[PDB]
Design an enzyme around this catalytic site. Sequence first.
Site, PDB file in Angstrom:
ATOM      1  N   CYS A 117      20.050  46.711  20.720  1.00 18.19           N
ATOM      2  CA  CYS A 117      18.968  45.700  20.788  1.00 18.19           C
ATOM      3  C   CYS A 117      19.220  44.744  21.962  1.00 18.19           C
ATOM      4  CB  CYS A 117      18.819  44.921  19.481  1.00 18.19           C
ATOM      5  SG  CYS A 117      18.820  45.935  17.975  1.00 18.19           S
ATOM      6  N   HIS A 165      15.489  38.266  16.432  1.00 23.94           N
ATOM      7  CA  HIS A 165      16.097  38.667  15.162  1.00 23.94           C
ATOM      8  C   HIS A 165      17.599  38.508  15.108  1.00 23.94           C
ATOM      9  CE1 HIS A 165      16.045  42.949  16.917  1.00 23.94           C
ATOM     10  NE2 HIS A 165      17.332  42.792  16.566  1.00 23.94           N
ATOM     11  N   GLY A 213      23.700  48.242  18.134  1.00 22.52           N
ATOM     12  CA  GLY A 213      24.270  47.346  19.149  1.00 22.52           C
ATOM     13  C   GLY A 213      23.462  47.353  20.427  1.00 22.52           C
TER      14      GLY A 213
END
EC number: 3.4.19.12
Lengths: 300, 301
Positions: free
Chosen positions: A145, A41, A143
Amino acid sequence: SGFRKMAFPSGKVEGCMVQVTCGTTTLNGLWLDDTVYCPRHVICTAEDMLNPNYEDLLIRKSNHSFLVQAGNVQLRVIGHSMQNCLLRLKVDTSNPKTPKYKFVRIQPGQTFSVLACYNGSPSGVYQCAMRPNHTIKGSFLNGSCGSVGFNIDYDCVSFCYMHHMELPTGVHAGTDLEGKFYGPFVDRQTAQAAGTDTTITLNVLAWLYAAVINGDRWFLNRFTTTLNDFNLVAMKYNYEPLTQDHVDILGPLSAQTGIAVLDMCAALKELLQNGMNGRTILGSTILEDEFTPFDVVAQC
Amino acid sequence: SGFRKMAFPSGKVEGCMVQVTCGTTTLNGLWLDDTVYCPRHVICTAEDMLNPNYEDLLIRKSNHSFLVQAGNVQLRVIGHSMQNCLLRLKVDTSNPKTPKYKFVRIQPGQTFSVLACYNGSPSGVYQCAMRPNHTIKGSFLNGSCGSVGFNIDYDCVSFCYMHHMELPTGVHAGTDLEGKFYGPFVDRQTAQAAGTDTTITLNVLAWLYAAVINGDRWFLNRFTTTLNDFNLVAMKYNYEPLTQDHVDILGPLSAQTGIAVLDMCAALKELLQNGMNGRTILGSTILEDEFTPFDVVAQCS
């Protein structure tokens, strides 16, 4: 002595964390050999997330679109692909800090350590468990991920989780290191709810044994149960049924205390249908389910 | 979101852990530059631990009495000295993996990360707090002595704790990195008790803020209190007195959540006097006191 949720030492993992940027999105990636793994993503904008065509979005990217930084070093992306919900970036440098490792899929009720990371920089480490409903109860901010979950065996790091997103109930969802989500989740902005969660019966039983070890005795009885009758009551109260493997995992604890597994099941059975009713067990009035038999044994 | 007891990443410390053996006593040591720090009771036999004179026992040892091992390599002891309850071994090689570091003596109520080790080998990492009674509620087994507590600020490792022993109650006692014990304890095998512990009020209030930041405000109320009236209740319930400096430290959490410190004190007072009313806070049926205001800001900012 002392019961504490303990994480594995994170040094071997810290050496593999990098920052990956695409467009205006920055997150964490895992640098193993000449490959960098991160959530796919990162290639999306805000408008894309609503309904992303990931093949289409990747087609429109280039090698130079992906920025990978390890400490002060820019890495050069020389190839890109996508495996399930993971981006895989080929870099022209092999990570010299790469440990012996494997990618394993973990099962509900099992525990692992999480190295929470921001901008490719490790911030903290903690232990947690994969819940029955395939979510984790972690601590992630924006932040994070790309942060990885892992276990350590000898000098071999077993990677088992990469963080992808926070659900609306405040719990967390991600994938294994093959990019396959845990549970029925997808990397899309769609209304998504974790299924109603259940209690990890195996761990509650371990907690009850630990409570006996530490002198707590009041929940035991002389009642008898079979595995089947226990599992039928367990499911009624949103507890996981006990497996055959589970009973055997509890063997050491039963020997140590002299209380047969099914007798402990009989004790739990009563607790479920009545309640604890303000009596403490190990100092707490609620049953804990994230402490495994392996935790109790190794610390008792 | 979410809230978790979190330890610092242990990589920088892991590369300082070594094994130290003297006779059939083996335990952990801390290798920085050309010095290995370790508890001095590694020099003791079975007999010795009962009534040790450490000066006397040390002078009888040579550099060769000490086997220091870093993984595969062996280091050569080229000198030694005792500092308080630590032995400082000089070795022929400097640690290439030495981080920027400092030794600090932490204060009761502060937290630090512990890297629990066995035979010079790091095993687990967890967070805990220096208790008001100068013990720590750790998780240690035999062979853990010499395991270290630390904090990390940016690129600098502040070492604050080395483990020495477990007390009869099961709690843990050790020293700072100059070898001075936290608390009234000594490194001798006799039965020693800690003083009566108190609850770290500042920390409980921080954790109530964390609970609010994480969308759980069930225990708030419409009341407020004076500092002085809160402190009478604190004292009755075995909590540390809150000071104006403590109130100041909570400023940012108060500002972030929009709940005034004295209003959070009112909520706490009610929680102490009535109980938790069958509910949990951040998944707990106990009021948690091992997260500092700093730990909460760091994790919930």
